[PDB]
């Protein structure tokens, strides 16, 4: 089990670690988070008490280095940083642990929620969507725009999600206009899966990452990507059995985890009604349809 120590907490902030969150008061003797499960990506995220504007955070994997948080009073945020000196790091953590100034990643043993939300999400793929090659960890926030959002303004601070556009030459083969528009199977199976993602694992990884950025940061562009990647599958008449079965499980845990009070802004009525009731796959998402109907029957 791994640790993200904090230098200090000089400003009152709500700290997220994955699906958990703790309020820390201005100058509270908080020195970090211990017992973080090895084997998954994690996100550590922040909402300042005095300006709830810009939720922001860091995607990281503790197998890839020793990471700590330090408040920068110039840029006014909690920053992730890598400690290259292994012995210094182990010694900082040991001191804070012995003084019990660290909160415990509060994982329930039966609870597979985080695994289920990050099953296909890999740090290497995150670092290609969020480009900042000098760091092993990835910054995301509320206001960052997607490559696609910018096409329709600072390129280095963009989310480089795969562009999906149902009315693009990429989506539509010459002479198969009606076929490809009403049945997106060629765009999903040849262009996206075989062409760009290489396999359904990379496709689900991006879909899951897009959801988590939508949920944790209210990132609007990430919400658009998650819906697009769902709609591309649901709008395809030909999808491998294993992908449909996996998709039902993925969306199930996403809907289960979503804050109940956020379904108004995070869920797109048109996409969900279309995916569950009208599409080719309207009968292939049993688990997802049962939770959506019991938890968000207003949306439908």
């Amino acid at each position: 089990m791994n640790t993200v120590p904090f230098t200090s907490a000089p400003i009152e902030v709500t700290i997220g670690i994955d699906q958990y969150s703790f309020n820390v008061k201005e100058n509270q003797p908080f020195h970090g988070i211990k017992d973080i499960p090895i084997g998954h990506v994690h996100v550590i995220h922040f909402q300042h008490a005095d300006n709830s504007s810009m939720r922001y955070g860091y995607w990281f994997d503790c197998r890839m280095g020793n990471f700590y948080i330090q408040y920068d009073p110039k840029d006014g945020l909690y920053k992730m940083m890598e400690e290259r000196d292994g012995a210094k790091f182990e010694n900082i953590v040991h001191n804070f642990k012995e003084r019990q100034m660290m909160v415990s990643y509060p994982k329930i043993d039966e609870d597979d929620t985080w695994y289920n939300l990050t099953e296909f999400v890999q740090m290497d793929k995150i670092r290609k969507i969020v480009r900042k090659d000098e760091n092993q960890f990835s910054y995301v926030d509320s206001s960052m725009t997607t490559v696609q959002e910018n096409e329709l303004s600072d390129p280095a601070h963009s989310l480089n999600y795969t562009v999906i556009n149902f009315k693009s030459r990429e989506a539509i083969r010459p002479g198969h206009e009606m076929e490809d528009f009403l049945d997106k199977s060629y765009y999903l199976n040849t262009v996206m899966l075989q062409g760009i993602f290489k396999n359904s694992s990379n496709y689900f990884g991006e879909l899951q990452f897009a959801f988590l950025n939508a949920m944790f940061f209210g990132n609007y562009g990430s919400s658009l990507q998650w819906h697009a990647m769902i709609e591309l599958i649901c709008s395809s008449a030909t999808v491998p059995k294993h992908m449909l079965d996996k998709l039902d499980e993925i969306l199930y845990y996403q809907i289960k985890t979503l804050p109940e009070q956020y379904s108004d802004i995070l869920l797109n009525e048109r996409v969900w009604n279309i995916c569950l009731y009208s599409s080719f796959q309207k009968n292939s998402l049993h688990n997802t349809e049962k939770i959506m109907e019991n938890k968000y029957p207003e949306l439908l």
Binding site: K167, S168, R169, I172, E177, M178, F181, L182
Partner: protein, 237 residues
């Protein structure tokens, strides 16, 4: 975006544009079968593609053979309309290609947009105007060429005959829409009004009678009165 009453004059400016109407593409007669079920028999159709400035009408006849062994024909009809409009634009020289295509029904937007991906600089627009282009098949010579077709065929007309020699395209368009609105409301009455005086004829190379300026004013008045009469019937007002 959407074409309406406010931006009406734009139809007659010097930017090439076409109206597309798909209402006569897929046409059927509904009938009873021997077992007492209902069946449709398709008849020849047409795409109505009109330059409102010049009067140039590209009448693409849709032969019943294009439906043979196809399913969901009302859906296919929108895609076949978009395919044919796309083929017409590609067949025109660059300086003849439209800068805008206005569809008279919103269900045409996606099919036309997906067929015109190759022309990202051609704007595909809906309209809020209720245009009477459905009534094109009430023009005897257009109806005749559609029904006699034995294969797919493009026929070129000028729907304004020689009117632009004497009037503007604004006035020519207003005359055309009033004639078509009348034909659509009361075909029998409208056609009676247009042939009432047997001395006025339709030239072999024309669609409408050869009315003098004064006879057009009379005809236009009769068409307006026909439209109010019919209106004070549908609604009893």
């Amino acid at each position: 975006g959407a074409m309406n009453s406010s931006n009406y004059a734009e139809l007659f400016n010097n930017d090439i544009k076409l109206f597309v109407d798909d209402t006569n593409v897929y046409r059927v007669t509904v009938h009873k079968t021997f077992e007492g079920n209902v069946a449709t028999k398709a008849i020849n159709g047409c795409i109505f593609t009109l330059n409102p400035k010049t009067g140039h009408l590209f009448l693409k006849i849709i032969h019943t053979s294009v439906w043979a062994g196809q399913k969901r024909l009302s859906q296919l009809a929108k895609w076949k309309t978009a395919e044919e409009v796309s083929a017409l634009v590609r067949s025109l020289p660059k300086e003849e290609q439209p800068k805008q295509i206005i569809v008279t029904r919103k269900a045409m937007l996606d099919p036309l947009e997906v067929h015109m991906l190759d022309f990202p600089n051609i704007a595909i627009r809906p309209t809020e105007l209720r245009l009477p282009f459905s009534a094109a098949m009430s023009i005897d010579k257009l109806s005749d060429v559609v029904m006699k077709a034995t294969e797919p065929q493009m026929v070129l007309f000028n729907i304004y005959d020689d009117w632009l020699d004497r009037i503007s395209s604004y006035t020519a368009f207003s005359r055309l829409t009033l004639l078509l609105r009348a034909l659509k409301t009361n075909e029998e009455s409208a056609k009676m009004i247009l042939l009432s005086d047997p001395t006025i004829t339709i030239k072999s190379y024309h669609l409408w009678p050869s009315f003098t300026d004064e006879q057009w004013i009379t005809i236009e008045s009769q068409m307006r009165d026909l439209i109010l009469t019919e209106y004070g019937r549908k609604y009893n007002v």
